[PDB]
Amino acid sequence: YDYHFEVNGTVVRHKNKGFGYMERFFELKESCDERSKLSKKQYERFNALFNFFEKNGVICMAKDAGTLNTSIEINSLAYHGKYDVMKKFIEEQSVSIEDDYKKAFFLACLGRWEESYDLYSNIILNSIDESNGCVYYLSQINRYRIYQSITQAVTQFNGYKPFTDEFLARIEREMTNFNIDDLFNGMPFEFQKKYKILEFLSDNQFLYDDTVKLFELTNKVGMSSDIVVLLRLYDNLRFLYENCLWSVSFHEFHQYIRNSMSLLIEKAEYERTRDIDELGFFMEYYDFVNISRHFKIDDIKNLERSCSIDKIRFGEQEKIEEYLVGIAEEITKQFSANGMNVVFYTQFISEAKAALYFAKYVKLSEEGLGKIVKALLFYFPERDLDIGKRYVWLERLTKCNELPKSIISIIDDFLVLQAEKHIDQNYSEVSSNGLYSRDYGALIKHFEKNFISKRLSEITLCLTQDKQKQIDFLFKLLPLLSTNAKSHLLSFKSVENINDLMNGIRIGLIDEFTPEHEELIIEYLETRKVNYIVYMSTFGIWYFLEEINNSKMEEFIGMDDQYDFFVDPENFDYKKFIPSWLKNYNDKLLGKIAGNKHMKHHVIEVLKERVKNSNDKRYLEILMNYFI
Amino acid sequence: GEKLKEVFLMLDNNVVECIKEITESSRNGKLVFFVGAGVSTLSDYPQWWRLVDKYHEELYGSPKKGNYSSDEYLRIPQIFYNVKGEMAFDGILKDFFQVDKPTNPIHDKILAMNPAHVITTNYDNLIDTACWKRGKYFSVISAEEDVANATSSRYLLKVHGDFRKGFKGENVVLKEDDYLNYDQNYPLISNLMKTIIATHTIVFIGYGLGDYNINMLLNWVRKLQKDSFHKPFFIRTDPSPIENETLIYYENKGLRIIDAASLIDSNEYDYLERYSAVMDLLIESQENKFITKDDEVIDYIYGKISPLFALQYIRKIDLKHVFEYDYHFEVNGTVVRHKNKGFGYMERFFELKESCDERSKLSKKQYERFNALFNFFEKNGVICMAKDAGTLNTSIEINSLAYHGKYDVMKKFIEEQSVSIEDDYKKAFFLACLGRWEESYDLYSNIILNSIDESNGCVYYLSQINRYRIYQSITQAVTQPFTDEFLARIEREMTNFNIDDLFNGMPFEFQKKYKILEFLSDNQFLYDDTVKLFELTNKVRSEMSEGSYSFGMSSDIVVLLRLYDNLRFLYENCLWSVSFHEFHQYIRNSMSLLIEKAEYERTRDIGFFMEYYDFVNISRHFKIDDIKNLERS
Amino acid sequence: GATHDLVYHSKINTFVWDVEFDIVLELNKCYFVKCFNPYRINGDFAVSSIDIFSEGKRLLEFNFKITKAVHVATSKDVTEIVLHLSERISSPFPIVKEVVYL
């Protein structure tokens, strides 16, 4: 309870009754002449204390400032991913017990919990005799942390056996009464005052202080509180990762980082959008790593549905590119041959899903997007990310960047690969969205519009009439293949199917109105009249956008009011048009309803009425963007 | 499991009493085990007779004719030490005692009885390294200067020494030679042994009745006075059942024999199951699987809830810490089960609460205790468990005249004469609220001086805490009214206050019964519901961007009822720490995010109905600018 | 009586709630998911795209007169409420079991 130590490296005085000793320290630090007048041993001690306070960033007091810069730098290979360097660093021989300590933490990170437990126990057994019991004490703490980790691994994953039941019974035999609360208060007299500050490491809910500081960033507030909480955040991460603490992975910490950059991004949203009156948070590499690692996929989605992150600028794009190329490369090595360590799998897949979700806003390069898209489509596993959500992620990636030729070639390789997996007539094509491989075709038809498939054309040329699903997969992806191929599978056609090939145009038949089929539409409307006398809006929409040229659909008006609503807009009574009916139209179709004259005059009244009723803002956003 | 249940059904009366006193002394944190060789040799540790063998055949040649008597176990190696030499003696000790034997499983359960100290007569590294593995610290003492470095308050008293400082015969008591003049070489381990023995509950496990250590101790306690010492316990695990006469005799010298051969039916070389028979009979008594009938459940609740008959209102987060990591107590009054290994005692409590007929079949005194526990749990709102619900209603009601303003009634309540020290306590808090800090300080000091003699030290402890709180209040008042006589007097008397060990200086009764009040000696105990507010961040405040009229129960009612739990705690227990900035910070941000989430709830159309208590909270804990900020948000 | 799970997801006017349909459009064990892609490339002109399951895709014709709906993990068929919410909402597919929100 001496000098307050601030979050920028400045020191202010508080409750120090006595000589200003930090003040004489900094004055002796500034001028060299007073620094000279001293004996040898404590000049060396001054060099040591000097190296300490420059290493922790603690600089001269609040009397002199202006050059206050905080370049944060976590120098640890467990923060930057660096997993192949981590394994490489494991296999060498140790020379010290500190090397044993870092190797234990690294090996604990990449899904290997047993050998890190044993190496922890080796540090306990081989440092108890030697002084400075911090490495010892931290080893004990971390050994219990990894014990809780392993028992969490049999708490969840048995709800495959990751560890053998010899080890799982041994540690449960030896660690099942652990009461850490008096561990530090059993340490010697030296380790009860010198390292008395480490007493929160025998607990977990020590996160309370900066958590309440986040509530200042709630409590409804140059230099703001943002830089305070951000630098205290980086103080926390640099503590738990550079001191190699295993308690960084427990849920309270991810809770804290989660909510921390939640409220920082929400406050930058509440900062630049102050422009009622007159008319921030610049991302770096560490913000990208924190967003990818501590958030979840749904939470980044929640940030996108709360704060406009498209405004938020991004810097240091090359190191972020190294993190994404590294993360995709480690996906590639994760599923090249083997190595499916289920522990490391669950962690690394959560990070890789979140990072590839957040990689939309990043200005990637040529070969970077090459390795990322290749590892996303080919090597990236199922049962977490399926083939529809790879259009979510992939189309998310392949929209902000102008698509190079090689990327379309790789997606073509994916389509050929899916055709080669449609050679078995049991291929399910599972999808948790409803999006399928035809959308992959639509992607290539969006960014190239003139793409002729070559090897897929060769597959359709050697296509045999014994594999129906294979043909179907060649038949949904229809506008990609050559003309002789078109002769081949357009021979494989059934034209009497009115409303399969319609019902969802499942093959992409919107390429042509082959005129007997539009006369088929017409005679279908005759059959509607026939089974009247005593889905459908799509027909009407196909009249609305000047696509079918026959007009006698006005004869078939009288069964569906939406049919009248797209065929004869003038004579239809705009007083019983249900509004519902508009939350299910595309932007183009709503744009073309907005492009009329007698339509707009009434739907502004009904839509403004339903907006005016309680709070409907789909109708107000459509009303402010399409209809206005 | 069931076998030991039948063992508990077939115990003698004095045996059951001994299981009670060992168990409650384990619960007090005062239970010192004096263990021996028979515990350590089931880890296959080499006993002393093998060394009398090897030192013997390395002395005389000529292996033993008949058998050794008592003194030869000390005499023959002594011969070796005097004649053959130091290095040969220490070399043979170095050979036989260089073992890396694993631990006996009863070591796990000795260290699972929460011992205060562990006094041993062993020479190994089993109990201590087992204590390093089980995350406790016992002060491993094996020398004179090891006593001076008493690094903790939990002692592992190796009274004979240890081979930590090398395998040297100088370091341990093995020769005769050290049993002769033992009161001249280890005077301080002697004094500490007498100290720990006289001030605890001592349990003898691994010995023979007539072993020389026990003979020395019985000599010393028979030199002591007779009203003063606690009679220790002797757990006898021998192959032979003890006869009655030596039992009665060793009851008269001061020990209490719990036999193990008479409880089970075991073999001759079957030591381990007999040790584990008695030791599991103690552990399962802690874990209360021996609790079967009405008078056994209704007391174990009572023995933890009758302390809290004094306080006005207890939170439902801390009531989890009453029944230590048992049943989760939810914020609506429901109880779900978690980590309770043993009889469902709350379940029998609520079933006895529902039907009157089972409620009838009980003795008088604990039917009255059931009425008391019943009045408690209805007063704190704790109702029947999660099996039956639907009428879950939470009508919050802070019945305090410091919450509703009521200032003229407060002054009126001040000027009457007190009849109790509780009336003194409420008058002190009320008078503290309405700007009168000096007389409330003096009345606090009156409660400290006039309740220290009387039991149930909660009112005392809370008075101390609140006196320091009002001291911080007054020094805040001269930080940012009072005469400089008072302002120098309290600054004279309260300027070294370190509250962190105040509760850990309270008696043994006030260290477990009111152990849940330990956060009141701190301030940043607001952490939990603060992070729960961040659930109301973490985007179940997602519910705007997708239309969702989700009809059910959200996190809003959870955080709101936990908020009202907090306010009802700090105002009905008359705590002065309600006025410090962290609490206004918490209520501030709490209804900030509740109102912001109701804003993020009804505007999902791509709630939060105010009552009186919401109006009072908005007026009191917000500021003017913050209510303006809520209107502009 | 499963109103404690019934939502009214109203960007697309659905009722996301796990039932299991038995339809005649004759089938058994049908459940529905719906999309919300208003930026769908070349995929008709509608945002919502139903993806009817019959333990896998039906490969879809359509009269959808539901015969038997039953709520998962609490039984006693909820068919009257399914007809009532079918009567109120004039849209395709009132009871959808999941929503993607692209």
Residue numbers in the entry:
A (entry chain B): 336 to 494, 504 to 565, 577 to 634, 644 to 898, 912 to 1005
B (entry chain A): 12 to 491, 506 to 631, 644 to 670
C (entry chain C): 9 to 33, 38 to 55, 58 to 74, 78 to 119
Copy the relevant paper text.
DSR2, a Sir2 domain-containing protein, protects bacteria from phage infection by hydrolyzing NAD+. The enzymatic activity of DSR2 is triggered by the SPR phage tail tube protein (TTP), while suppressed by the SPbeta phage-encoded DSAD1 protein, enabling phages to evade the host defense. The protomer structure of DSR2 revealed an architecture that consists of an N-terminal Sir2 domain (residues 1–298) and a long C-terminal helical region (residues 299–1005). The Sir2 domains of two side-by-side DSR2 dimers contact each other to assemble into a head-to-head rod-shaped homo-tetramer of DSR2.
Then, we collected the cryo-EM datasets of DSR2-DSAD1 complex for structural analysis. The resulting 3D reconstruction achieved an overall resolution of 2.9 Å. The cryo-EM structure of DSR2-DSAD1 complex unveiled that DSR2 in the complex also forms a head-to-head tetramer. Interestingly, two DSAD1 molecules were observed to bind to the C-terminal regions of DSR2 on the same side or opposite sides of the tetramer, forming a complex with 2:4 molar ratio. That is to say, the two adjacent DSR2 C-terminal cavities within each DSR2 dimer exhibit the ability to bind only one DSAD1 molecule. This is caused by the asymmetric property of DSR2 dimer at each end. DSAD1 only binds to the partially opened cavity but not the closed one. Comparing the two cavities of DSR2 dimer, we found the closed one is too small to accommodate the DSAD1, and the conformational discrepancy of C-terminal domain mentioned above also prevents from DSAD1 binding. The surface view of the DSR2-DSAD1 complex structure revealed that DSAD1 engages in simultaneous interactions with two adjacent DSR2 protomers, and the primary interaction region can be divided into three distinct interfaces. Furthermore, the superimposed structural analysis demonstrates that contact with DSAD1 induces a conformational change in the overall DSR2 structure, which may lock the DSR2 in the inactivated state.
